[PDB]
Design an enzyme around this catalytic site. Structure first.
Site, PDB file in Angstrom:
ATOM      1  CG  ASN A 103      41.508  37.461  40.125  1.00  0.00           C
ATOM      2  OD1 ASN A 103      40.885  36.455  41.114  1.00  0.00           O
ATOM      3  ND2 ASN A 103      42.152  37.109  39.070  1.00  0.00           N
TER       4      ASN A 103
ATOM      5  CE  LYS B 173      45.789  37.574  40.245  1.00  0.00           C
ATOM      6  NZ  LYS B 173      46.955  38.147  39.864  1.00  0.00           N
TER       7      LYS B 173
ATOM      8  CG  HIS C 111      43.603  35.653  35.130  1.00  0.00           C
ATOM      9  ND1 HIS C 111      44.937  35.474  35.561  1.00  0.00           N
ATOM     10  CD2 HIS C 111      43.309  37.083  35.532  1.00  0.00           C
ATOM     11  CE1 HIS C 111      45.327  36.690  36.161  1.00  0.00           C
ATOM     12  NE2 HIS C 111      44.301  37.564  36.289  1.00  0.00           N
TER      13      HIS C 111
ATOM     14  CD  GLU D 186      43.870  41.309  34.095  1.00  0.00           C
ATOM     15  OE1 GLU D 186      44.146  40.035  34.085  1.00  0.00           O
ATOM     16  OE2 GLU D 186      43.689  41.708  35.173  1.00  0.00           O
TER      17      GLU D 186
END
Lengths: 255, 254
Positions: free
Chosen positions: B8, B10, B96, B168
């Site tokens: 990821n 971001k 997320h 996560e």
């Protein structure tokens, strides 16, 4: 004030559609210089739009439909002004009613985006507008003044310098029902008067666009009003012949 | 389950970096088999990423960091699953914590996104995880069970087939304070178990990735655990050496 005509493509675009529309639009504006024509494609096509406009040496300005408040870092899924700048995108729409409604973007959040854009050297296209009920209840300037004041009171009137304001009567967006050019002119003069209460210099130079359902059939009527400096076009933006017609009416109208 | 390693990026990317990283990445993974490697660049660089990968004839998968609920129409600024498909993107990160915290995305919203992605033939990478406080309180599984049921109880267990779940723990994200491989395994086993209480066929097949702070130095301890099928990487994904390392570790171990 030099007119500015911006096309907000919204959630429309495909690889073939982007190049055909930008290629054709550019052919249509082949001698037209009295207007600033900007286009705002979905984030996914900002790259293809730059490539196309570059290859053609187009003067068409590139923009985007929204921004977030960070340039880099741990913010999954966010829009970064610095990344936009790598593609030459400069005019960034913020506060659109669809986002204010569907994503519940507040005046405070929108004003924060205005400041970050300014910090990054980009041009915010601040959208403001009343709803059907506010309109009917006669609160149009109350809502507008309130939304403008979110940036004016926290940042100062001079923050509007180099910014574009698009007045959009919410009920006029996508609905086919456009405000009349006379009522639009009436609201723009007051939006201008509000800013002038704080600065006449800023007020005289700020480009205030109209954002109802601008179509080629009603464009000239709008561009004929002294306080209407351009248009933020949605649906008519998706047709090169339609958008080019709207752009020309603005060029002829303000010469 | 074939392991899947996803990076990821971001809010990180530039025209130089995207090309460099993706090229180096492909160089380092040259010949590595047995792992599905995926990258999620910011939407502005999906075009670039697709062109770069295709030129390289790369097998790296293209993903994106979010999605909205419509493919087209009057939705200024939205992310279209249909438009993402045009660039060959298939793995979409949703839920997320950065988006849940910052954009206040609720379990319901994230679930609608899960359903829309499935309906568009895309693969959801559903993100679930507990905060620091919820952990101190001993609420880890309650939270993962709640966030997961938003999908399970509404779309049915079968909905999880073909999707990826990334567990996560929020306090391990970009903190360097990663969960031990043992806790991670504990939690993944209980999530799978929660799922198997409705379908063991779905449960034994669903890929469950660990999120925390996976690094080249700790990746294989994770990949040794039987219920950890891959890893969702943040920081270590911004470097080709590291990320290829993590990917190789998963291939070896599985």
């Amino acid at each position: 004030r030099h007119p500015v005509v911006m096309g907000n493509w919204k959630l429309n675009g495909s690889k073939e559609m982007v190049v055909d529309l930008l290629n054709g639009l550019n052919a249509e504006l082949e001698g037209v210089t009295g207007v600033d024509v900007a286009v705002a494609p979905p984030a996914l096509f900002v790259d293809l739009a730059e490539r196309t406009l570059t290859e053609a040496g187009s003067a068409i300005i590139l923009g985007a439909q929204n921004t977030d408040l960070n340039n880099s870092g741990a913010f999954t899924g966010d829009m970064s002004p610095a990344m936009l700048k790598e593609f030459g995108a400069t005019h960034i729409i913020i506060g659109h009613s669809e986002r204010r409604e569907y994503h519940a973007e507040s005046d405070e959040f929108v004003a924060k985006k205005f400041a970050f854009l300014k910090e990054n050297g980009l041009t915010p296209v601040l959208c403001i507008g009343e709803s059907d009920a506010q309109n009917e209840a006669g609160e149009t300037m109350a809502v507008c003044a309130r939304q403008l004041d979110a940036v004016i009171n926290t940042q100062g009137v001079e923050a509007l310098e180099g910014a574009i304001i698009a007045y959009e009567p919410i009920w006029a967006i996508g609905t086919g029902k456009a405000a009349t050019a006379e009522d639009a002119q009436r609201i723009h003069a007051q939006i201008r008067a509000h800013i002038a209460e704080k600065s006449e210099a800023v007020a005289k130079n700020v480009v205030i666009q109209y954002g109802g359902s601008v179509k080629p059939e009603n464009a000239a009527a709008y561009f004929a009003q002294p306080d209407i400096d351009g248009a933020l076009v949605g649906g008519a933006a998706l047709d090169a012949k339609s958008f080019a017609a709207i752009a020309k009416a603005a060029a002829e109208a303000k010469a």
